[PDB]
A paper describes a structure:
There is a growing recognition of the importance of protein kinases in the control of alternative splicing. The serine residues in these sequence patches are phosphorylated by several protein kinase families, most notably the serine/arginine-rich protein kinases (SRPKs) and the CDC2-like kinase family (CLKs) (Colwill et al., 1996; Gui et al., 1994). The phosphorylation status of SR proteins regulates in turn their cellular localization and activity.
In contrast, superimposition of the two CLK3 complexes, with KH-CB19 and CDK1/2 inhibitor, revealed the preference for CLK3 to adopt a more open conformation with the P loop moving away from the ATP binding site. Therefore, the markedly decreased affinity of KH-CB19 for CLK3 may reflect the energetic penalty associated with its induced fit.
Numbering used by the authors: 134 to 483
Amino acid sequence: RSVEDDKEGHLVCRIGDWLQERYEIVGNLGEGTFGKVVECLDHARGKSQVALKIIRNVGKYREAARLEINVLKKIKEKDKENKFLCVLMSDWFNFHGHMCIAFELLGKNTFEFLKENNFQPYPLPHVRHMAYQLCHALRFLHENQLTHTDLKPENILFVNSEFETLYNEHKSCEEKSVKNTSIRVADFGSATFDHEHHTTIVATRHYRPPEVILELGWAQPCDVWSIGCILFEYYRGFTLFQTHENREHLVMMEKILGPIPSHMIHRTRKQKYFYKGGLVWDENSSDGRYVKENCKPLKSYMLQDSLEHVQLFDLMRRMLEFDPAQRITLAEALLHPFFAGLTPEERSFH
Ligand SMILES: Nc1nc(Nc2ccc(S(N)(=O)=O)cc2)nn1C(=S)Nc1c(F)cccc1F
Ligand SMILES: [Cl-]
Ligand SMILES: [Cl-]
Ligand SMILES: [Cl-]
């Protein structure tokens, strides 16, 4: 059987196809610039269901995937009972130049669920449970000297994304409400140990913290900022920072969170963003006018005034502190009174 690649180096495969006389493809899960993700049955392990990430036959992707595999091995080694909520690898192999990584099959990611729910946001009890698990998952990675650097809703999966369809009487429309809010953290390809080389830029732009934009260096607090942006997005169903460029991003940060601390401004070599100790930007530009119209103080985005909403917003604001040294740690976050509302099942991790 000839193995075939398309023009971009993606493996040509379809439902029905097999790999290593072992993994039978039974579905398509998704795709990206890295290649594709298929659902397989693993005939060597009782037909167990797997998500198999199939990387393009392109050197720079094969190399990144090899690094991801190495990261995953180290993580598994530190969490042998798979207790700390990560999507860990069951197998990996090089298939005619395509690196393939097999993972236990979970449900949809939290972005895809949001999207299939027409971007209607998660209810607060759901946001609260998800935030709790995220703080705990990352706290454990952080305590093992690791930073994720690429947290975003697409990288957070429901263990099971089965939902109930409920009629929202205030909206005159149906809503999908996930039956179980247990989640797992995925995509460790960019994860960086304390002692390893730190690239100047990390994170997906919408989830990238100011110390990274200002090239001030970064560590574990990077992940805390990203979690704050994620929690906003779960709660409102739209992205906190919908931006494509650094200068606009910083202006959004200022409108939503207040001024950038002067000490950060004085320390950055990125002085092109500043003029006279202050952000410089064209208020009359397409980006200028978009930000002035759409970006408001964080507190203004609260849907309700009850105590649990106030506590969410207090927590989010502490996650979104400009100075990574002042930013709440996840150890501290887990002590926040926002988490008093967890059911005992949610708190003990069921
Ligand atoms: N372990 C695992 N299970 C799943 N399941 C899944 C994926 C997509 C969908 S879909 N097609 O969006 O409804 C449903 C279930 N995905 N998955 C993984 S590791 N996805 C994944 C990811 F979440 C981030 C980067 C690469 C990936 F391959
Ligand atoms: Cl490319
Ligand atoms: Cl191995
Ligand atoms: Cl200005």
